[model samples]
Target: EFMVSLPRMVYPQPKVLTPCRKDVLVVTPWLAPIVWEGTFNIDILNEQFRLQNTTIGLTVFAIKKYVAFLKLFLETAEKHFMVGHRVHYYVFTDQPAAVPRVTLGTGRQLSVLEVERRFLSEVDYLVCVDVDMEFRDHVGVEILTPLFGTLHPGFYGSSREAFTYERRPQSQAYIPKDEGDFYYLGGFFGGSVQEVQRLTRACHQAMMVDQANGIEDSHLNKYLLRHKPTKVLSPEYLWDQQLLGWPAVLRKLRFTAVP
Candidate 1:
């Protein structure tokens, strides 16, 4: 459970006079690292995680008509995801016949489960992602943390008032217009196995109160406001180049829509 420290390795200094290591806060008064390409040192992160032999679990659910997208999704993942680390792909599909047998790389494997998230024991961290997208560039270990959520691509630049949090008081996902941290998207979010399960339970209870109470993303915002993520990924982690053209600021569109 305790950490095993890294041996000495030389790396360029960061913001010399700024006196901040890769450790400085990036956004909001809530204090969580805003993940972008330049905010991290992959060599250091990789060494730290690999020392512990950290196993990452990536989950995707392919239901009904959309079952065919797994082809490129899984193929692209083999090319770019967590390159040298242990990865377990959990495929939850109702239509098992449609999931293509994309070749698996070394230290990687897939398990097709026809239902709920039951592969909790085999991994240290679990990444919950949508299957309607493809990986574009390197999406390695830089984003892992105790808990993390990607900023909503469209709402990242939008002010709090513009954030689409639930407005009605009767809804379980209600949040005042003046009160919001960030509009955290639900398509991709994750943390340690324990915390992800905690988040899932919270969301389930909120939805159980009333079917109309919380749209998924609205409730995700409400929950994240109450419980801040240790790391907040930039909108770069999830984007839609198909609809929204690439911005100069978006250094890389790591994961994107298929349209």
Candidate 2:
């Protein structure tokens, strides 16, 4: 396993190294640091990922009514998401003609996948997000990990007991109130290609098991507990201006939900 050595100055200032959300633990028991703005050095991360020639596959489902979000979604993504790295934007939409003609940068391209394929051999990592959102700041390579889950903006300040997990006994997505690491948002999650495939396949099968019994978001957290993500992103990675305005704790608002 290769590791990139960051410059000594790359570490954030001592005072600035505080957690964005004080209510939650910044690091998991398994030792994966919960990602916040001040916790990472983008220069080092970018170099590390770039040296490997990492190709990221960004997947967004914009079916039916959600297709309207594609234009701004793609535009902002082109400006912010994985700027210096090779990215393949996999847009899954029912309406191909409605898809915008957003020009992509070098080493980046868009592919509209109508009938989604399991094939993901081309990319080193996969980042899955919802379409009803826009990039407000730098949502870049610092987020890449073997497996990762972003904290739901609504639940980051709340304790684990307050996490809205599935409570039903019969559902495959059920997670008792006593057992959970973090309340992960279903809309944004990803990992290495193999891990992404594993997660998606497992979630799909689990969903089928409790088709009418569980919540999609709850099932997602259940899966993440069994298979812990390598990193946990803070609410800064996924926020909504309506739910939260510009706050002092948040150093940067990367991607945000839109009305």
Candidate 3:
């Protein structure tokens, strides 16, 4: 008994899982809309690129507006985010040649599923952001520290005008009259890699259904309505250019340098 006790005392017990610290994977998908050309300015582009380099950075999946945004996006991200320990920007696009110096070994133009697989294997947390959005807040990434455990999705426009299900309202995606628990904005979001993987695949599947049904914007929102993301972020995280006129936005904007 003494001999057994001595050996047991010498060996340390295994540590339990603690939720204190976690790594995050930030991601985004830029859909090429018809009005995209007018939506982003060169200076805004430069500023967004500058912010991408300086902040936690983003992984953007882009199509259509490839010529105007991809080059600038990649160059700025590579310059800033390549050397960071906690941040990674994974850009998913059909065109790889237009994006210069992107390390092929890193797997650049992969699907969202591939991104989920990689992040699940390599990271603890995941954030999906819109490429066109800029972070004017100097402390933007840091705010996410407290945002773990709960998911955070962007909420653009008025709280009432924010992503809703009513048809012909602020958005095309309408929630069935029966369901009101649905609240999600697709612009920016964050969660555990495991959580996001589940949510994203679900969103992807819903998108396919929407495509088949000839529906639009509300597709992803419908998925969230069914899945019900546990973490609902405040609108500060997803400020739209059209909705910035709100008095609350004045307090949210932080000074950031544009390179």
Candidate 4:
């Protein structure tokens, strides 16, 4: 129940006088750290999480042709994901046998369940993502928070009015042109197990209201507007460098959309 202190370790001290990232918005008006490159030290973060003996559960949905991308997705993850920590990959698929047995690292494991997803292990945090993407760079413990959401690459630069909130006035996620803080892509989102369960239950309840939810992303935006993520991941966590160029904000494209 109590967090243990980090063991003695050596590393460059953080510069107190300088900003982590000067050009980009690194903190939301609500005060949650908007994650971006230079905002965190992976080594320190790793130690902190490891001290707690954290077990991260990653969930991905793959059915039909979605299976084609599973191998690359798993392979890339081993190289760049929360390396060295305990990991449980929950793969929900219609065709369980088709799911590949991609070799995992020392502390990582995977499971294939039929059209559903608990997580295995005492999973501290759960990261739910689609199966079509691969890790392009480091996406380590810097992302683990009580609750977090990744920015939608297309809307990060555009004003809130441009966010593709549900235009229809009937849905629970009906946000008019003038409302919204940030557009969170449903592609990647996570939190502590308790928080993720609460968030998903809230989303399910809202979806139950309309008998069908607004696009999942819109509902997620509505929820975050009130609850607010403890950490807001920049577009770097879920990027597609195709339509969006690395011009204004992002430095390292971590997890990315694959063709």
Best by lDDT: 4
TM values, all candidates: 0.93, 0.89, 0.51, 0.93
Candidate 3 residue 233 C-alpha distance from true site, Å:
2.4
For model 4, residues 1-259, the per-residue Cα lDDT tens digits are 7888777888888888987777998899889999999888888888888888999999999999999999999999999999999999989899998888899999899988898235433588999998899999999899999999999988888888888887788888778887788999999999998888888989889888877543438788888887989999999999888777676667899988885
Q: Model 1 off-target regions past 4 Å?
A: 18-25, 116-118, 212-216
lDDT of 2 by residue, 17-136 (tens): 654567446788999988887666687778778878889999999999899999999999989999989999999888988899998999998888884235456788899999999998
lDDT at residue 70 of model 4 (Cα atoms): 96
**Candidate 3: lDDT of 241?**
40
Q: Rate the local accuracy (lDDT) of all candidates.
A: 0.86, 0.85, 0.43, 0.87
Q: Candidate 1 overall Cα lDDT vs. reference?
A: 0.86
What is the Cα root-mean-square deviation between model 3 and the actual structure?
13.9
117-163: candidate 1 lDDT, tens digit per residue: 45466998999999999999988888888889999999888899998
**Which scores greater on TM-score, model 2 or model 4?**
4
Query: Each model's RMSD to truth, in Å?
Result: 2.7, 3.1, 13.9, 2.2
Show the lowest summed lDDT stretch of 10 residues, model 2.
6-15
